[PDB]
Design a protein around this ligand. Sequence first.
Ligand SMILES: CC(C)CCC(=O)N[C@H](Cc1ccc(NC(=O)CCc2ccc(Cl)cc2)cc1)C(=O)N1CCC(C)CC1
Ligand code: NA
Length: 259
Amino acid sequence: ASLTEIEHLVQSVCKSYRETCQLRLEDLLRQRSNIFSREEVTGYQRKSMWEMWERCAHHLTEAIQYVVEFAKRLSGFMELCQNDQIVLLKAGAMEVVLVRMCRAYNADNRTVFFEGKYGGMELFRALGCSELISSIFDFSHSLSALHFSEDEIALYTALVLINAHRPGLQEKRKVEQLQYNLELAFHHHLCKTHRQSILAKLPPKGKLRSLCSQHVERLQIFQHLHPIVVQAAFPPLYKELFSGGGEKHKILHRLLQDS
Ligand SMILES: CC(C)CCC(=O)N[C@H](Cc1ccc(NC(=O)CCc2ccc(Cl)cc2)cc1)C(=O)N1CCC(C)CC1
Ligand code: NA
């Protein structure tokens, strides 16, 4: 590529992200004052473990769907073969969500936007995975210190998804070329905005990998406790990406093929 193409890729990636960001940043900031009362927090704690899991699985699925749409709009993604598109999404969609949610996190009071209001870790105690919850909050606390702009999140999450090292890629060279151009765009934008200092503060890939593994592991614990809840009340896309043996569903293939 050349310089004019990279500048175009920067605006292309930032545009695809704005069209699929799920929640605009200003809308998330305007809600920061709206925090669950101590009686509303106790209500969430009084909910059953199985109800909190399906409510969280529903919100995770909604977020993942926007990441799929981000991928389809992402320059060069739909040119890859379908096997590679599915490998990249299965490996990275959750990782993109884990990065995106820092916008919905308030580092001042350590709360996240959940079901119309902001609440802390104590809101999710009924899940029975306090270690995973605190790892999630800590990860959002870390990214919040970086003070990401919307353009930086756009370019970073594009690279989280377009990773030529994902096992199972049939056209590794083709993903490499797309990843190299997206790297150039991200680094060129950081250079122009004088934000190259964030490169050393970005979390290691093994951290996002550890969070996704913690999610699958705690789901397997819950699935053992309430297998019918997962089969009957969890979204099909969620089961395809996280539940064994739930990969039998093909949701993503339909999501990608349409339009
Ligand atoms: C920029 C916007 C798109 C950000 C919008 C946004 O906030 N999305 C996330 C999605 C989400 C949902 C659930 C989790 N995990 C859990 O609840 C733990 C249980 C678990 C374990 C394993 C699996 Cl596989 C699935 C669930 C992680 C993330 C979100 O809604 N929240 C609110 C509550 C959680 C605790 C933090 C983040
Ligand atoms: Na933040």
